[PDB]
């Protein structure tokens, strides 16, 4: 019955498009469709001096990479899970599944 | 000894002095015809009451 699908992605526009596409698919099948849950973004960061030597005013930069994520929890029969999984390929988004 | 005159400020004119610390002001005394020109150093609002030690010493430059 239940499935939880994690769409994980370090680009916001892609994840927004792919989730809108999958939401449209859900509402076109109409199994009591719903929005995705927007997850707390993972943020990995590094802070370093700009100059390659000691000279000048010490100026510092913070680089941070953001891994966005969205979860769909959903009700489907096993055939529809097996058949719909054909949607979950050729994406820069990484896709993962949980089941009970 | 504690002689004093109370005067009412009617106008302010110019920020004045090294660093612009003072303000040129026109003051009328409360119980005399006299109206003076004076420099004052705190923040001042029109219609303030100020206490003077002399009714005569003046800043003629106005």
């Amino acid at each position: 019955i239940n499935v939880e699908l994690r769409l994980l992605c370090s680009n916001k526009k892609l994840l927004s498009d792919l989730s809108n596409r999958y939401y449209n698919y859900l509402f076109q099948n109409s199994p009591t469709a719903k929005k995705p849950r927007v997850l707390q973004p993972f943020i990995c960061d590094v802070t370093t001096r700009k100059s390659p030597c000691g000279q000048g005013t010490a100026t510092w930069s913070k680089y941070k990479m953001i891994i966005h994520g969205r979860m769909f929890a959903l009700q489907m029969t096993h055939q529809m899970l097996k058949d719909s999984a054909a949607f979950l390929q050729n994406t820069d988004v990484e896709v993962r599944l949980t089941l009970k | 000894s504690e002689e004093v005159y109370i005067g009412e400020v009617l106008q302010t004119l110019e920020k004045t002095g090294p660093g612009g610390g003072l303000t040129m002001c026109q003051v009328q005394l409360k119980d005399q015809k006299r109206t003076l020109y004076r420099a004052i150093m705190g923040p001042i609002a029109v219609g303030d009451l100020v206490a003077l030690l002399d009714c005569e010493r003046e800043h003629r430059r106005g």
């Binding site: 370090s10 990995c44 590094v46 370093t48 001096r49 700009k50 390659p52 930069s61 913070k62 680089y63 941070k64 990479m65 953001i66 | -």
Partner: protein, 65 residues
């Protein structure tokens, strides 16, 4: 490599073996340039602060704020 050393006990007749722990600069050389100094070790990078800034945008890091 985890190198091993022999050591003798107080009798100077019985022998035992002990392992050398891998620590310090000697194995943490910059993966782009072999440098020993200013190596960022976080997130299992092993890249020096000079090399990082030219490649950061290829890896996918950005300055947001």
């Amino acid at each position: 490599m985890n190198k091993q050393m022999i050591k003798y006990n107080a009798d100077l007749e019985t022998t035992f073996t002990v392992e050398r722990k891998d620590f310090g600069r000697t194995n943490r050389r910059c993966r782009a340039c072999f440098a020993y100094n200013g190596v960022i070790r976080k997130y299992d990078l092993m890249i020096c602060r000079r090399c990082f800034r030219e490649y950061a945008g290829d890896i996918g890091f950005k300055i947001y704020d």
